Design a protein around this ligand. Structure first.
Ligand SMILES: *[C@@H]1O[C@H](CO)[C@@H](O[C@@H]2O[C@H](CO)[C@@H](O[C@@H]3O[C@H](CO)[C@@H](O)[C@H](O)[C@H]3NC(C)=O)[C@H](O)[C@H]2NC(C)=O)[C@H](O)[C@H]1NC(C)=O
Ligand SMILES: *[C@@H]1O[C@H](CO)[C@@H](O[C@@H]2O[C@H](CO)[C@@H](O[C@@H]3O[C@H](CO)[C@@H](O)[C@H](O)[C@H]3NC(C)=O)[C@H](O)[C@H]2NC(C)=O)[C@H](O)[C@H]1NC(C)=O
Ligand SMILES: *[C@@H]1O[C@H](CO)[C@@H](O[C@@H]2O[C@H](CO)[C@@H](O[C@@H]3O[C@H](CO)[C@@H](O)[C@H](O)[C@H]3NC(C)=O)[C@H](O)[C@H]2NC(C)=O)[C@H](O)[C@H]1NC(C)=O
Ligand SMILES: *[C@@H]1O[C@H](CO)[C@@H](O[C@@H]2O[C@H](CO)[C@@H](O)[C@H](O)[C@H]2NC(C)=O)[C@H](O)[C@H]1NC(C)=O
Ligand SMILES: *[C@@H]1O[C@H](CO)[C@@H](O[C@@H]2O[C@H](CO)[C@@H](O)[C@H](O)[C@H]2NC(C)=O)[C@H](O)[C@H]1NC(C)=O
Ligand SMILES: *[C@@H]1O[C@H](CO)[C@@H](O[C@@H]2O[C@H](CO)[C@@H](O)[C@H](O)[C@H]2NC(C)=O)[C@H](O)[C@H]1NC(C)=O
Ligand SMILES: *[C@@H]1O[C@H](CO)[C@@H](O[C@@H]2O[C@H](CO)[C@@H](O)[C@H](O)[C@H]2NC(C)=O)[C@H](O)[C@H]1NC(C)=O
Ligand SMILES: *[C@@H]1O[C@H](CO)[C@@H](O[C@@H]2O[C@H](CO)[C@@H](O)[C@H](O)[C@H]2NC(C)=O)[C@H](O)[C@H]1NC(C)=O
Ligand SMILES: *[C@@H]1O[C@H](CO)[C@@H](O[C@@H]2O[C@H](CO)[C@@H](O)[C@H](O)[C@H]2NC(C)=O)[C@H](O)[C@H]1NC(C)=O
Ligand SMILES: *[C@@H]1O[C@H](CO)[C@@H](O)[C@H](O)[C@H]1NC(C)=O
Ligand SMILES: *[C@@H]1O[C@H](CO)[C@@H](O)[C@H](O)[C@H]1NC(C)=O
Ligand SMILES: CC[C@H](C)[C@H](N)C(=O)O
Ligand SMILES: [Zn+2]
Length: 902
C-alpha cells in the first residue's frame, strides 16, 4: 500500500455530520506588520469503516490546542481511542491524527482544535482586503474558499461531496458588522475577555459543501428589500458607495431573478435570506457562496451618471449567474471537480435566462452567441483543446482542480447545455431539471445523473423523438474535444461533417472514441421558412432533400446557432444568401445574419472558402441596423486591421468601412435627435456604440466632427460632462486623436481626479490615442510611476499605446529597453509580462519583425522572462503564423477592398 495521508483524495472511512466554527480576525497588525486570525472548531463525524487514523484537511494553520493538535471525544456514550500523535503533512494539506486503537462503524466522534493563521492579503481562505475611505486605510476580513481553501480557515473534510451543517460564530470589533451564509441568531453580545469585541452567532446552515462557506467582518452598509415570501434581500457595499445609490440596480434585479429561478427550477429558494456584497478589488470576480455572494465592485455596483449600458448588462448577468448557482451547484453539488463544467456551464447558460427575466426588453438571450459560442469555438477549433469531461481519477491536486476553471468548462459547457435544452425543448429540459434537483437536493451528483433525469422526462412523453439516448448524444459533445464543420452541397442535398480546425495543416494527436464524429441536431430555414428538424447521425456523410435547393431558392442551417457547430455551403447557395441579405435582410434571423459572417471568416482561415467570399458576406451591412451582424464583422476584421494598418491595404479598408457604416451613422443621427437621446433597448444602444466607434476610427468626418464638438464642450465646462457614458470611450479617443496637448493635458487632469474605476479606465485608454509621438513617449514615461499610474494599470496602459499605430514602435522600444524591470516587478507585485508581450508583439507580421523578436530574446543570459517565458515563445510562433497569413492574403485582400470601396 501507500500511506493514506500521502494520497490527495480523502479516505471514505469517516464522514462529517456538523461543524462548530468560531473565527476571530485581528484587523490590526501585530506591529511586525503581521495580521492574524484565531479559530476554534469542533467537527462531529461518523465512522463508516474501522480505521485508526483521522485524516482531515489543514492548510497554513498553526495549532494551539491543549495537548496534541486536536482533542478527540466520543459522542453520547461512545468510547474514543487515545491519540498517539498528531502531525501535519503539507504536500497533501492534511492534519493527521494517529490513534492507539480503531474507531468503530456507526459511532460518532467530536474533534476539537484551536488554531491560527495569517490574515493575508492573498484572496484565499479567511483573508484581509485593504481599501481607502478618504484619508484612512480601511481593512476588512472576508473569505474565498473556492476551491480548496476552506481548509486554510479551519480544519475540515474539504471535498465538495462531504457536506455537513455549519454553526458559525464570528468574534469581531464591536462597531463592525459580521456576515455569514445564514442570518445571525440574534443581537451580538460582548466578548467577556474584552468587551471591545462582540460575538455574532449565526443560524445553522443547511447540509452544504465547505467551498461555499463565507464570513465577513467589515464597516459595510446595505440597501434592503423583503420579497413577498419574507426572503430578505440586501446589497452590501462601502458606506460611500451605498450613500451614492450605487447598490440600487442590483437590488432592483435581484428579486425578479430569484423569482424567475424558483419557478424555472420548480424549487423554492432554499435559504431565509440573500446577501450580495461588493468588494473592492476582488480579483476572482464573483463567488456563489450560499446566501452570501461576493462580487468585485464593478460587477455589482452601477452608477447611472457614469456607467454605460454594457456596464448595466454585466451587472444583471453576473447576478443571474451567481444566483443560478444557489440551486444548481449549491443545493445539488457535483461530486468532484472533474465535473466542474456542468456546474459553471449550466450557470453560464441560465445567467441569460435569469437576466432576461429582469430585463425582458433587452433580448439578452441572443448574447450567448457572440459572448460564449464563438468565443470558445476559437480555442476549441485547435489541436491543443480538450474534452469537457476529464476522468475523476486524473483530477487530484489543488493545481489540477484549478485547471478545470477555463473557457471550455464555462463557455462550451454553456454552449452544449443550451444545445441540449433546444433539442429537448425548454419545457422538457425544465421537467428533467426539476426532477434532478428534487431527487438530489442537499447531496452530490455526476453529469450522468442529470442525463438520467432528462431521459426520464424524454421517456415520459411522445412528441420529442431523438435518434439515440440523451447520454449517447451528449457523449459525443462531452467525451471528445472540438466540434464539426457541417458542409452542405445544395445541388444534391448531400451534407457532411468533419472535425473543424482553423489550421488546415494541424496534426490532431488526441484520439477520440468516436473518430471525431458527432450526432448533430440540425435546424434549417429555406426561403425564410422554418423546415422540419433533422438529425445528422454519426456518419461522415448523408443526404436529405431538406438541404436540396432549386436555382432561385436558398437554405440556411442552424437557426439562431443553437447547435455547437459551424456551417459551410456550395458557392451558389452562398450567393443566394448574399442576394437575400442585400434585398430583404429581414427574412433571415438577426443571429444568422451574424452567423454567415462569423462562420465564413473562420472557414476562410481554415482554407474552406476563399477569403473574398467572407468579405462578400459583409457587403450587406450598409443597410444593417442591428447590433450582432456588425459585431461579427468588427470581430472578424480586427485581425485584418492588426495585420494591415501599416500597409497599402489600409486606405481601401478604411474607405470600404466608411462606406459601409455611413448609413448606420446617418440612421442613428436621426433616431437619436442630433445625438441628444439614446435608443431605448440594449441591442440598439450597442449598435449605436459600435457604429460610432466604427465611423470614428475609420475617419468618417461627421463622426470626427461630433467627437470634437462634444469634447470641446466638455472642456469649456468641466463639471458638466456632456458625453453620454455609452459614447465616452470613442469620443474621448477620437478627440484626443484630433487634438494636441490641450486636449491631452485636460483628460490627464480628469484622469487624476476621477473617483470611479470605469471612468478612469476610459480616460487612460483614450490618452493612448494621441497622434503626437512626443505625447505618447511622455505618457509611456509615466506608466512606471506609481504616483501617476497604478502598477496594476501599467502594462495595460503600455498595451493601449502599442495599439495605436504610431504608438507601436514607441511601446515596443520602451518594453525592450526597460525590460531590465523583471527585477523590480517579478519583485514588487506580479505584473503580467505575459499580457504585455502579447499586446506589444500582436502586430508583428514580417520576417524583419521576427528577426527583432529573436534578437530581443537573445538577452537570455539572466533576467529571463518570468510569467511571460511561455508567452515570448507564443510570440515567435504567432509572428511565423502572421508572416505566412500576410503573404497568402495581402494581394487578394488589397484588390477586394479596392474593388468594393468605389
Ligand atoms: C456547538 O455550538 C452550540 C452553540 O454554542 C453548542 O450548543 C449549545 O450548548 C450551550 C452550552 O453547552 C447551551 O447554552 C446554554 O448553556 C447552559 C450552561 O449552563 C445550559 O444550562 C443551557 O442548556 C443552555 N441555555 C439555553 C437557554 O439553552 C445551548 O443549549 C446549546 N445551543 C443550542 C442547542 O442551540 C454545542 O454544544 C456546540 N457543539 C459542541 C460539540 O460542543
Ligand atoms: C505559525 O508558526 C510559524 C512557525 O513558528 C510562524 O512563522 C515564524 O515567524 C517568526 C516570527 O514571527 C519568524 O522568526 C523570526 O522572528 C524574529 C522576531 O519575530 C526575527 O528576529 C527573525 O528575523 C525571524 N527569523 C527569520 C529566520 O527570518 C519566522 O519567519 C517564522 N518561522 C518559521 C519557521 O517559518 C508563523 O508566524 C505562525 N503564524 C501565525 C499566524 O501564528
Ligand atoms: C430601480 O427601479 C426604479 C423603479 O423601477 C427606477 O426608478 C426610476 O428611475 C428612473 C430614472 O431615474 C426615473 O425615470 C425618470 O426620471 C426623470 C428624472 O427627472 C424624470 O424626468 C421622469 O419623470 C422619470 N420617469 C418616469 C417614467 O416618470 C423614474 O422616475 C423611476 N421610477 C420610479 C418608479 O421611481 C430606478 O432607475 C432603478 N434603479 C436603477 C439604478 O436602475
Ligand atoms: C449546530 O447547531 C445545531 C442546531 O442548533 C445542532 O443541531 C442539534 O444537534 C443536536 C445534537 O445532535 C440534536 O440533539 C438537536 O436536535 C439538533 N438541533 C437541531 C435544530 O437540529 C448541531 O449539533 C450543531 N453542530 C455541532 C457540531 O455541534
Ligand atoms: C470603529 O472603532 C475604531 C476604533 O475606535 C475606529 O477606528 C479608528 O478610526 C480613526 C478615524 O476615525 C482612525 O484614524 C484610527 O486609526 C482608527 N483606529 C484603528 C485601531 O484602526 C473606527 O473608525 C470605527 N468605525 C466605525 C464604522 O465606527
Ligand atoms: C412545481 O411544478 C409543479 C408542476 O407544474 C407544480 O404543481 C402544479 O401547480 C399548478 C399551479 O396551480 C397546478 O395547477 C397543478 O395541478 C400542479 N401539479 C401538481 C402535480 O401538483 C408546483 O406548484 C411547482 N412547485 C414549486 C415549488 O414551484
Ligand atoms: C453523495 O450523493 C449520494 C446521492 O447521489 C448520496 O448517497 C445517498 O445517500 C442518501 C442519504 O443517506 C440515501 O437516501 C441514498 O440511498 C443514497 N444514494 C446512493 C448511495 O446512491 C451520498 O451519501 C453522498 N455522498 C456523501 C459522501 O455524502
Ligand atoms: C452525394 O452523395 C452520393 C453518395 O451517396 C455521391 O454519389 C456517389 O458517387 C460515387 C462516386 O464513385 C458512385 O460510385 C456512387 O454510385 C454514387 N451514388 C449514387 C449515384 O447514389 C455524390 O457524389 C454526392 N454528391 C456531392 C458530394 O456533391
Ligand atoms: C431566433 O431568435 C430570435 C431572437 O433573436 C427569436 O425571436 C424571438 O422570439 C420570441 C418567442 O418566439 C419573442 O418573444 C421575441 O420577442 C423574439 N425576438 C425578436 C427580436 O424577434 C426566434 O424565436 C428564434 N427562432 C427560433 C426558430 O428559435
Ligand atoms: C503535420 O504532419 C505532416 C507530416 O505529414 C507535416 O507536413 C506538417 O508540417 C505537420 N504539422 C503541422 C503543424 O502542419
Ligand atoms: C421583408 O420581408 C417580409 C417577409 O414576409 C415581407 O413581409 C416584407 O414585405 C418585406 N419588406 C419589404 C420592405 O419588402
Ligand atoms: C471566485 C469565483 C469562482 C471561480 C466562481 N465559481 C465563478 O465562476 O465566478
Ligand atoms: Zn459560476
Amino acid at each position: 500500500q501507500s500511506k493514506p495521508w500521502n494520497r490527495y483524495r480523502l479516505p471514505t472511512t469517516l464522514l462529517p455530520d456538523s461543524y462548530n466554527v468560531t473565527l476571530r480576525p485581528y484587523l490590526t497588525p501585530n506591529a511586525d506588520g503581521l495580521y492574524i486570525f484565531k479559530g476554534k472548531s469542533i467537527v462531529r463525524f461518523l465512522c463508516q469503516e474501522p480505521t485508526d487514523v483521522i485524516i482531515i484537511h489543514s492548510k497554513k494553520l498553526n495549532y494551539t490546542t491543549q495537548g496534541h493538535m486536536v482533542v478527540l471525544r466520543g459522542v453520547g456514550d461512545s468510547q474514543v481511542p487515545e491519540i498517539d500523535r498528531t502531525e501535519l503533512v503539507e504536500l497533501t494539506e492534511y492534519l493527521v491524527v494517529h490513534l492507539k486503537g480503531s474507531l468503530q462503524p456507526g459511532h460518532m466522534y467530536e474533534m476539537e482544535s484551536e488554531f491560527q493563521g495569517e490574515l493575508a492579503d492573498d484572496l484565499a481562505g479567511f483573508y484581509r482586503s485593504e481599501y481607502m475611505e478618504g484619508n484612512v486605510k480601511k481593512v476588512l476580513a472576508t473569505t474565498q474558499m473556492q476551491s480548496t481553501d476552506a481548509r486554510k480557515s479551519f480544519p475540515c473534510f474539504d471535498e465538495p461531496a462531504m457536506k455537513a451543517t455549519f454553526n458559525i460564530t464570528l468574534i469581531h470589533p464591536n462597531n463592525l458588522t459580521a456576515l455569514s451564509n445564514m442570518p445571525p441568531k440574534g443581537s451580538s453580545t460582548p466578548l467577556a475577555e474584552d468587551p471591545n469585541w462582540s460575538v455574532t452567532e449565526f443560524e445553522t446552515t443547511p447540509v452544504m459543501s465547505t467551498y461555499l462557506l463565507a464570513y465577513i467582518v467589515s464597516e459595510f452598509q446595505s440597501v434592503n428589500e423583503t420579497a413577498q415570501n419574507g426572503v430578505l434581500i440586501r446589497i452590501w457595499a462601502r458606506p460611500n458607495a451605498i450613500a451614492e445609490g450605487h447598490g440600487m440596480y442590483a437590488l432592483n434585479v435581484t428579486g425578479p431573478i430569484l423569482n424567475f429561478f424558483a419557478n424555472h427550477y420548480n424549487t423554492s429558494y432554499p435559504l431565509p435570506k440573500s446577501d450580495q456584497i461588493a468588494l473592492p478589488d476582488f480579483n476572482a470576480g464573483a463567488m456563489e457562496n450560499w446566501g452570501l455572494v461576493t462580487y468585485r465592485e464593478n460587477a455589482l455596483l452601477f452608477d447611472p451618471q457614469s456607467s454605460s449600458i454594457s456596464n448595466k448588462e454585466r451587472v444583471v448577468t453576473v447576478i443571474a449567474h451567481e444566483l443560478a448557482h444557489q440551486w444548481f451547484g449549491n443545493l445539488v453539488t457535483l461530486a468532484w471537480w472533474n465535473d466542474l463544467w456542468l456546474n459553471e456551464g449550466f450557470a453560464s447558460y441560465v445567467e441569460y435566462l435569469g437576466a432576461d427575466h429582469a430585463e425582458p426588453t433587452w433580448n439578452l438571450k441572443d448574447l450567448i452567441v457572440p459572448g460564449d459560442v464563438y468565443r470558445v469555438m476559437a480555442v476549441d477549433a485547435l489541436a491543443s483543446s480538450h474534452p469537457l469531461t476529464t476522468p475523476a481519477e486524473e483530477v487530484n491536486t489543488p493545481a489540477q482542480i484549478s485547471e478545470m476553471f477555463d473557457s471550455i468548462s464555462y463557455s462550451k459547457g454553456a454552449s452544449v447545455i443550451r444545445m441540449l435544452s433546444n433539442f429537448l425543448t425548454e419545457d422538457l429540459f425544465k421537467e428533467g431539471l426539476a426532477s434532478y434537483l428534487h431527487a438530489f437536493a442537499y447531496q452530490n451528483t455526476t453529469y450522468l445523473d442529470l442525463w438520467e433525469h432528462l431521459q426520464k422526462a424524454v421517456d415520459a412523453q411522445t412528441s420529442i423523438r431523438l435518434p439515440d439516448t440523451v447520454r449517447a448524444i451528449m457523449d459525443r459533445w462531452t467525451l471528445q474535444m472540438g466540434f464539426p464543420v457541417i458542409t452542405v452541397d445544395t445541388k444534391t442535398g448531400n451534407i457532411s461533417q468533419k472535425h473543424f480546425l482553423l489550421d488546415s495543416e494541424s496534426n490532431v494527436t488526441r484520439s477520440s472514441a468516436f473518430d471525431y464524429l458527432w450526432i448533430v441536431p440540425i435546424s434549417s430555414i429555406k426561403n425564410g421558412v422554418m423546415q422540419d428538424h433533422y438529425w445528422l447521425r454519426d456518419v461522415s456523410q448523408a443526404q436529405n432533400d431538406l438541404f436540396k435547393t432549386a436555382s432561385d431558392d436558398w437554405v440556411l442551417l442552424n437557426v439562431n446557432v443553437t447547435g455547437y457547430f459551424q456551417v459551410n455551403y456550395d458557392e451558389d447557395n452562398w450567393r443566394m444568401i448574399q442576394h437575400q441579405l442585400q434585398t430583404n435582410l429581414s427574412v433571415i434571423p438577426v443571429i444568422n445574419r451574424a452567423q454567415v459572417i462569423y462562420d465564413s471568416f473562420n472557414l476562410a482561415t481554415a482554407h474552406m472558402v476563399p477569403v473574398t467570399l467572407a468579405l462578400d458576406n459583409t457587403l450587406f451591412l450598409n443597410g444593417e441596423k442591428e447590433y450582432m451582424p456588425w459585431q461579427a464583422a468588427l470581430s472578424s476584421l480586427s485581425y485584418f486591421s492588426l495585420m494591415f494598418d501599416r500597409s497599402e491595404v489600409y486606405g481601401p479598408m478604411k474607405k470600404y468601412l466608411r462606406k459601409q457604416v455611413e448609413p448606420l451613422f446617418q440612421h442613428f443621427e436621426t433616431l437619436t435627435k442630433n445625438w441628444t437621446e439614446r435608443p431605448e433597448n440594449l441591442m440598439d444602444q450597442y449598435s449605436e456604440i459600435n457604429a460610432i466607434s466604427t465611423a470614428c476610427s475609420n475617419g468618417l468626418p461627421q463622426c470626427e466632427n461630433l467627437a470634437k464638438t462634444l469634447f470641446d464642450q466638455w472642456m469649456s465646462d468641466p463639471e458638466n460632462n456632456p458625453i453620454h457614458p455609452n459614447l465616452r470611450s470613442t469620443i474621448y479617443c477620437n478627440a484626443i486623436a484630433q487634438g494636441g496637448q490641450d486636449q491631452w493635458d485636460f483628460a490627464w487632469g480628469q484622469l487624476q481626479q476621477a473617483q470611479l474605476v470605469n471612468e478612469a479606465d476610459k480616460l487612460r485608454s483614450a490618452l493612448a490615442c494621441s497622434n503626437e509621438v512626443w505625447l505618447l513617449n511622455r505618457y509611456l514615461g509615466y506608466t512606471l510611476n506609481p504616483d501617476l499610474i497604478r502598477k496594476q494599470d501599467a502594462t495595460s496602459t503600455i498595451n493601449s499605446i502599442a495599439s495605436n499605430v504610431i504608438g507601436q514602435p514607441l511601446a515596443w522600444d520602451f518594453v525592450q529597453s526597460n525590460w531590465k524591470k523583471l527585477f523590480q516587478d517579478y519583485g514588487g507585485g506580479s505584473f503580467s509580462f505575459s499580457n504585455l508581450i502579447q499586446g506589444v508583439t500582436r502586430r508583428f507580421s514580417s520576417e524583419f519583425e521576427l528577426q527583432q523578436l529573436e534578437q530581443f530574446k537573445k538577452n537570455n543570459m539572466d533576467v529571463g522572462f518570468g510569467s511571460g517565458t511561455r508567452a515570448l515563445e507564443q510570440a515567435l510562433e504567432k509572428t511565423k503564423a502572421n508572416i505566412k497569413w500576410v503573404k497568402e492574403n495581402k494581394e487578394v485582400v488589397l484588390n477586394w477592398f479596392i474593388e468594393h470601396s468605389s
